[PDB]
Amino acid sequence: RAVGEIPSADNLKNRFKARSIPLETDFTNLIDLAEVGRLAIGQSPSQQSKTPGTGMELTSDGKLQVKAGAGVDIDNNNRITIKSGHGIKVDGNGISVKPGSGIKVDSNGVNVNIDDFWEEIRNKIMPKGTMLPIYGTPNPSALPTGWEWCDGKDGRPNLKKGKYNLLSGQSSGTDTFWADNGDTEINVLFVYYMIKVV
Amino acid sequence: RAVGEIPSADNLKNRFKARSIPLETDFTNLIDLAEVGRLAIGQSPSQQSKTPGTGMELTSDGKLQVKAGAGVDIDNNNRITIKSGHGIKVDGNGISVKPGSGIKVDSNGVNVNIDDFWEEIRNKIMPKGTMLPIYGTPNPSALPTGWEWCDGKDGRPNLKKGKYNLLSGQSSGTDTFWADNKNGDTEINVLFVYYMIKVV
Amino acid sequence: RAVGEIPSADNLKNRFKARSIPLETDFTNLIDLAEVGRLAIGQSPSQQSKTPGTGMELTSDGKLQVKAGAGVDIDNNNRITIKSGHGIKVDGNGISVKPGSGIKVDSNGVNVNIDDFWEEIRNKIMPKGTMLPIYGTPNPSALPTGWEWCDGKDGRPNLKKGKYNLLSGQSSGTDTFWADNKNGDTEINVLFVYYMIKVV
Amino acid sequence: SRAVGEIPSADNLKNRFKARSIPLETDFTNLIDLAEVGRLAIGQSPSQQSKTPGTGMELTSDGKLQVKAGAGVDIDNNNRITIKSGHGIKVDGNGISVKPGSGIKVDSNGVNVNIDDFWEEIRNKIMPKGTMLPIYGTPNPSALPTGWEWCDGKDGRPNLKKGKYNLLSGQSSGTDTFWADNKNGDTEINVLFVYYMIKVV
Amino acid sequence: RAVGEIPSADNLKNRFKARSIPLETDFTNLIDLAEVGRLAIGQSPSQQSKTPGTGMELTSDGKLQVKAGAGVDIDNNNRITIKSGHGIKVDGNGISVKPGSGIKVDSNGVNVNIDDFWEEIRNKIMPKGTMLPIYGTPNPSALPTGWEWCDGKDGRPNLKKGKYNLLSGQSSGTDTFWADNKNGDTEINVLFVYYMIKVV
Amino acid sequence: RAVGEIPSADNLKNRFKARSIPLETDFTNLIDLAEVGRLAIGQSPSQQSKTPGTGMELTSDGKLQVKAGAGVDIDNNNRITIKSGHGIKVDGNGISVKPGSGIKVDSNGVNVNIDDFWEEIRNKIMPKGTMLPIYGTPNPSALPTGWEWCDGKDGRPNLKKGKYNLLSGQSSGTDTFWADNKNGDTEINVLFVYYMIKVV
């Protein structure tokens, strides 16, 4: 090397000196960029609390992930999903109620459906063999399910066995008696008796 | 520069040597600081499985985020929410059952409310025009809703026509027969009751 | 130091130069490594949008975390759980329906249980002191809950005071009339029945 | 290294950094020792017993290492070390030599006396102008040395052939004669003939 | 540090990479500068002959110094000086010739000075008591030093006894003879001279 | 790596920034140390003249060495030595004057030695055959070298041939004339001497 080509000591010293502050600046930036990862997982000495954020944990090998609690699960594709218990179904419509006996679910919500249980309630209220009179101007209202007119058939009392057909208390069986001219008028209202067969 | 001032060769060499291990310690720490990020996303060569943690995925441009599955949604404010189907409402108070007909929902849970349907059950049991006798010590219990006394008003039967007012099987209209208390032979006992009739 | 030990100027130059590209690679790789964490929280100048990914937010001290919306809660051990409003139970078995009055919850769904409310429906339909006749082909059928036979005991009406025991409209009390079997011209049929009365 | 898959492991990175430490330590040790050479050369090293330039050398005030000239030594116009010559001495391309003056010749045998420059002066301190000497010639006299002539009467010279007998006599100037006999008398005088020369310078 | 302030990866990468060639240039120059002193002492792997230059040697502790040979000395003040032997003086005027007997040294050079030895030479030539005739033109040349006239004083011969004063014989003393100037046949010619005599 | 071991960012930053000044000191000192060699050879940009110091030059391969001028040589051992021309010799005693013909060198300096040339000077003054009268009483001084007594032997003249023995010009040979001591009228004085003759 030609000695004349080489710079002055002062030039050389200043070329070294002039890199100091750019270096400190680059390294400061590089350290802060790296610190981001540690802040993210909440393990930085500069944080108030050395713990991950809401709903997160750290695996043994430093993966930041969802910490699942009650009602939450992870499916086969590593997706966050809902664990369903009794009365719930989870499908593509989301979380919905599973209808059982006497219930029907719809856009109005969870609804009662009497079809499944009204007969059981009737049976707890009125026993087999209960008789009820129905007033009909000419005609009585329709038989409700489980009931039959008292027409004599099929084990059923006959209540057209005369002009007058009356119930009397506290025995089984039939009888007749005769009346009619006297001092005492008895009024009668005609009805149609039905009987609970079930 | 005055040559007397310049340190010895050993001072100088020692000054350079004394920084080597300090430097090694700083670069080690800095590299391990940098690595944390790559660990967090499950992409470190030092991890067994190079996959994000539970519930998580990476965007194609490097963001770590939740991966929503069945019943889970992301709302308009990027929050994690629940998707409700039929019979479920989701709001401020949380996930609740939406009450429909015959159902009331409170802190005891999902409850039957009979107000919405008991009448319908009654009508399946007891048709319009049903007549029921109520015994009254003097006074009968009050009418249930849908019932009236058989008092001869507004088309209803009049079971107060005379002293004795009996129901008889198996037709419509009224009639009368006579008993004779002077020269009668067979005693009939009678209990007075108050008949009501179902007017719905 | 003996001067013969010392390498050529060109050897010394070469060892310095040979480290330039390696050092550049190292610093390149360290910068990209440390970038991963900023990419992950969505704060990288290289990203379209400087926002966390779906479902995530940044705290003020730089933590990446789940952004909880409607139905979603964070428990005491920092877990993402469901917030249950009315109707809903959340526990180890998951999201279930909480059963209240008249409801039973099982593996078939939400079911109605009548035992909690059928009696209130009965009472809406039939008041205390209602009387019903029961035809017993043999004996009668059995008594329903809340009822009793009209056997004259405990303030109940005595419907076996005689041979013939009839109900009549439209009062309280008892009485008797006499039918003329002897010489009466009109037959009356009588079907015997067991009257029960509702005591609640 | 945009894609995360391309970025080396943390261990590999740390090992690349660690690997350079000792090579760096070596390189700097060598560079420092290379630099120290100059400081040693001028005898200013802390590691040297005496903080002085080596034999014959000094340092200028702006740091140059140069010769320190003492008695007899000079620096010429082209900055060359040379010899400073006083009287008797010449210094040129042939080296240091002796400057010859009067009566001296210098050659490879050394300094020599050259009588050509002074023998006449010595002669003149011994023998005055006018000195006459007789030369015996068996027939002929030896040849005249420089500065002498025969006494033949020319240019004011004594004439010693005027007669057959030409004798010198003390204690005057001039000439004269007296008569003897060739055969008769009582006392014989013997004569040897010579050739007289005279010093004319 | 607020993450928005931090530069892009790429920006940082260019900041580091831009220093490479400036650094190489600086180390190149600094090594070349260091190499100067090893070149100066003739100890450089790039020099054909690893030897100090003309006139120089290295001490054992690495000082670069003059190597003195014949005629050259180092004085007490470490100055390069000439060593002088017989015939020579070294002083402020430099190297000069020291004059001895019969020598004068001046700006013309080394000269013979006959005053110191011409008398020795005369004594080797002419013995004490030598007589020489001086032809006077009337008067004779001056006496050389060491000589006196033959005037008859202080034991000098008297060459003015008579009219005729001749040298003779082969002996010592004086005598006289008588010429027959009256009757003689043979003329004898006489030239007069001034005899001087060497008295040292 | 356990993330709890890694120090704070401010700690890491401070460690890098701590070294900045020490390194500025070290490189400054090292640059100054290297500069010493360039100063020594007088090639330093901070020197007024980019020239070697007094009596020095640089070889083309960069060696600092003595620049020999007139009088000065470099010997086969690379030593600075004196170059000797005519009249000078150089040896263990240094520079001295070399003695030739007619010259002796001692501590008094350069001396004329007449033994080498006085005979030549005699021969330029007096030729072979010169005759000189010596006065002595009763003996002459000793013969100088190169002379003999005129005693008639070995080709020399016989000046003791008679009672009186005179020299006469201007010729060769011998003769006799007669004086008259009885009758002569003219007195001649004679001084007796010893004639010697130069036989070289």
PDB file of N, CA, C and O in Angstrom, chain A residues 171-189:
ATOM      1  N   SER A 171    -123.895 -46.173  45.905  1.00  0.00           N
ATOM      2  CA  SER A 171    -124.055 -47.577  45.600  1.00  0.00           C
ATOM      3  C   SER A 171    -123.820 -47.751  44.107  1.00  0.00           C
ATOM      4  O   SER A 171    -123.670 -46.766  43.391  1.00  0.00           O
ATOM      5  N   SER A 172    -123.770 -49.011  43.670  1.00  0.00           N
ATOM      6  CA  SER A 172    -123.875 -49.329  42.264  1.00  0.00           C
ATOM      7  C   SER A 172    -125.209 -50.026  42.034  1.00  0.00           C
ATOM      8  O   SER A 172    -125.890 -50.380  42.992  1.00  0.00           O
ATOM      9  N   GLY A 173    -125.569 -50.191  40.756  1.00  0.00           N
ATOM     10  CA  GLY A 173    -126.800 -50.855  40.356  1.00  0.00           C
ATOM     11  C   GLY A 173    -127.868 -49.887  39.841  1.00  0.00           C
ATOM     12  O   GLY A 173    -127.650 -48.682  39.732  1.00  0.00           O
ATOM     13  N   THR A 174    -129.041 -50.450  39.545  1.00  0.00           N
ATOM     14  CA  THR A 174    -130.167 -49.737  38.969  1.00  0.00           C
ATOM     15  C   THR A 174    -131.370 -49.932  39.889  1.00  0.00           C
ATOM     16  O   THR A 174    -131.387 -50.850  40.705  1.00  0.00           O
ATOM     17  N   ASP A 175    -132.352 -49.038  39.760  1.00  0.00           N
ATOM     18  CA  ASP A 175    -133.678 -49.244  40.311  1.00  0.00           C
ATOM     19  C   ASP A 175    -134.648 -48.377  39.510  1.00  0.00           C
ATOM     20  O   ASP A 175    -134.228 -47.627  38.627  1.00  0.00           O
ATOM     21  N   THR A 176    -135.949 -48.532  39.783  1.00  0.00           N
ATOM     22  CA  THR A 176    -136.938 -47.580  39.318  1.00  0.00           C
ATOM     23  C   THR A 176    -137.848 -47.208  40.492  1.00  0.00           C
ATOM     24  O   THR A 176    -137.764 -47.798  41.568  1.00  0.00           O
ATOM     25  N   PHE A 177    -138.657 -46.162  40.289  1.00  0.00           N
ATOM     26  CA  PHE A 177    -139.733 -45.807  41.197  1.00  0.00           C
ATOM     27  C   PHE A 177    -140.744 -44.999  40.386  1.00  0.00           C
ATOM     28  O   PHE A 177    -140.472 -44.582  39.264  1.00  0.00           O
ATOM     29  N   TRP A 178    -141.937 -44.817  40.948  1.00  0.00           N
ATOM     30  CA  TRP A 178    -143.024 -44.220  40.195  1.00  0.00           C
ATOM     31  C   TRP A 178    -143.499 -42.932  40.868  1.00  0.00           C
ATOM     32  O   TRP A 178    -143.547 -42.826  42.098  1.00  0.00           O
ATOM     33  N   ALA A 179    -143.950 -41.997  40.038  1.00  0.00           N
ATOM     34  CA  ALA A 179    -144.516 -40.755  40.530  1.00  0.00           C
ATOM     35  C   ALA A 179    -145.685 -40.330  39.650  1.00  0.00           C
ATOM     36  O   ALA A 179    -146.100 -41.095  38.788  1.00  0.00           O
ATOM     37  N   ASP A 180    -146.211 -39.125  39.927  1.00  0.00           N
ATOM     38  CA  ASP A 180    -147.158 -38.384  39.096  1.00  0.00           C
ATOM     39  C   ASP A 180    -148.554 -39.014  39.240  1.00  0.00           C
ATOM     40  O   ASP A 180    -149.540 -38.245  39.146  1.00  0.00           O
ATOM     41  N   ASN A 181    -150.538 -35.221  39.222  1.00  0.00           N
ATOM     42  CA  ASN A 181    -151.294 -35.416  40.493  1.00  0.00           C
ATOM     43  C   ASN A 181    -150.356 -35.639  41.677  1.00  0.00           C
ATOM     44  O   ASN A 181    -149.719 -36.698  41.814  1.00  0.00           O
ATOM     45  N   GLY A 182    -150.335 -34.615  42.534  1.00  0.00           N
ATOM     46  CA  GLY A 182    -149.808 -34.678  43.885  1.00  0.00           C
ATOM     47  C   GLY A 182    -149.861 -33.268  44.460  1.00  0.00           C
ATOM     48  O   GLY A 182    -150.500 -32.396  43.860  1.00  0.00           O
ATOM     49  N   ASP A 183    -149.168 -33.042  45.587  1.00  0.00           N
ATOM     50  CA  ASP A 183    -149.066 -31.718  46.192  1.00  0.00           C
ATOM     51  C   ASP A 183    -147.713 -31.053  45.886  1.00  0.00           C
ATOM     52  O   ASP A 183    -147.563 -29.855  46.113  1.00  0.00           O
ATOM     53  N   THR A 184    -146.725 -31.802  45.364  1.00  0.00           N
ATOM     54  CA  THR A 184    -145.369 -31.283  45.213  1.00  0.00           C
ATOM     55  C   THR A 184    -144.835 -31.496  43.793  1.00  0.00           C
ATOM     56  O   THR A 184    -144.627 -32.639  43.333  1.00  0.00           O
ATOM     57  N   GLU A 185    -144.571 -30.364  43.121  1.00  0.00           N
ATOM     58  CA  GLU A 185    -144.030 -30.383  41.775  1.00  0.00           C
ATOM     59  C   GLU A 185    -142.504 -30.533  41.808  1.00  0.00           C
ATOM     60  O   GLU A 185    -141.805 -29.818  42.517  1.00  0.00           O
ATOM     61  N   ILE A 186    -141.991 -31.503  41.045  1.00  0.00           N
ATOM     62  CA  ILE A 186    -140.564 -31.682  40.840  1.00  0.00           C
ATOM     63  C   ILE A 186    -140.192 -31.185  39.441  1.00  0.00           C
ATOM     64  O   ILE A 186    -140.684 -31.759  38.466  1.00  0.00           O
ATOM     65  N   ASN A 187    -139.309 -30.174  39.336  1.00  0.00           N
ATOM     66  CA  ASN A 187    -138.804 -29.734  38.041  1.00  0.00           C
ATOM     67  C   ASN A 187    -137.604 -30.574  37.575  1.00  0.00           C
ATOM     68  O   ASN A 187    -136.795 -31.018  38.380  1.00  0.00           O
ATOM     69  N   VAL A 188    -137.513 -30.779  36.249  1.00  0.00           N
ATOM     70  CA  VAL A 188    -136.439 -31.524  35.618  1.00  0.00           C
ATOM     71  C   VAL A 188    -135.839 -30.767  34.438  1.00  0.00           C
ATOM     72  O   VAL A 188    -136.567 -30.316  33.564  1.00  0.00           O
ATOM     73  N   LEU A 189    -134.497 -30.718  34.386  1.00  0.00           N
ATOM     74  CA  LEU A 189    -133.755 -30.214  33.240  1.00  0.00           C
ATOM     75  C   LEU A 189    -133.042 -31.402  32.604  1.00  0.00           C
ATOM     76  O   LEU A 189    -132.357 -32.161  33.295  1.00  0.00           O
TER      77      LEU A 189
END
